Amino acid sequence: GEELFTGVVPILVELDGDVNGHKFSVSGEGEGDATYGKLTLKFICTTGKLPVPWPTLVTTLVQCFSRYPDHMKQHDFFKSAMPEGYVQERTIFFKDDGNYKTRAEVKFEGDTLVNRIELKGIDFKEDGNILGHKLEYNYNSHNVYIMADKQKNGIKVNFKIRHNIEDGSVQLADHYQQNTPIGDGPVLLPDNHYLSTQSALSKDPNEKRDHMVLLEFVTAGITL
């Protein structure tokens, strides 16, 4: 599965969402170069205006593109599940607000790495930070904690995202994630470790559709 990521791999992302009954779709295209832990993607809201802030969707919108140091290669669950793929489920709890529940499949379709996602958001406040579009268009760096989930033959991941608001407060988004293989082939169950992630958000000055350009670098690390 690691051999599939030695070069530049095209990526396709499709999200079908519904948040407090607001339906929307997002499509994304770009490419990933896992040797450098690098992702380059452009996402479009194909249904018109996106009803939630772009930053709230970043985690949902392919951890197989992380750079795993040579010394940690035995801990790369994400690549090991390929090409058959993995199921990625989350609940994201927005503090003092609603939650997203997502289910995605990440796998190859021919040469393309595809991330197909369904998202449902419930219990959001209609003039809160999410539905009221009060989050800054930026993104902090942080560490993602990966643990084996031996019983489920997969991993559990927990992490908190802090979305900056212009008063100097943050909107917390607490993530609980599970990943399981689609195939029944062998996978790598890791020891506890983390992914250091950084994300830069931007706009295409020639793009009239509601969109997000995203550049991300991710490198694993482990404590000895």
Numbering used by the authors: 4 to 64, 68 to 226, 228 to 231
Paper text:
EGFP is an archetypical autofluorescent protein in terms of structure and function. It comprises a core β-barrel capped at each end. HBI forms as a result of covalent rearrangement of three residues resident in the central helix (Thr65-Tyr67-Gly68).
The crystal structure of EGFPA227Δ provided structural information from residues Gly4 to Leu231. Deletion of Ala227 has little impact on the general structure of S11, with residue removal accommodated by another residue contributing to the β-strand and the termini shortening by one residue. Gly228 moves into the position of Ala227 at the end of S11, with concomitant loss of the Ala227 methyl-group side chain. The additional space allows the tyrosyl group of Tyr200 to stack more tightly against the β-barrel, which in turn affects the packing of the adjacent Tyr151 tyrosyl group in β-strand S7. The result is that both tyrosine residues are now closely associated with the surface of the β-barrel structure. There is a slight shift in β-strand 7 away from β-strand 8, with a hydrogen bond between the backbone N atom of Tyr151 and the backbone O atom of Asn164 being lost. As well as the loss of a hydrogen bond, repositioning of Tyr151 shifts β-strand S7 enough to allow the side chain of His148 to exist as two conformers (see above). Thus, while β-strand S11 housing the deleted residue does not undergo any significant change in structure, the repositioning of residues to compensate for Ala227 deletion results in significant propagated changes across the surface of EGFP, resulting in significant changes in β-strand placement and dynamics.
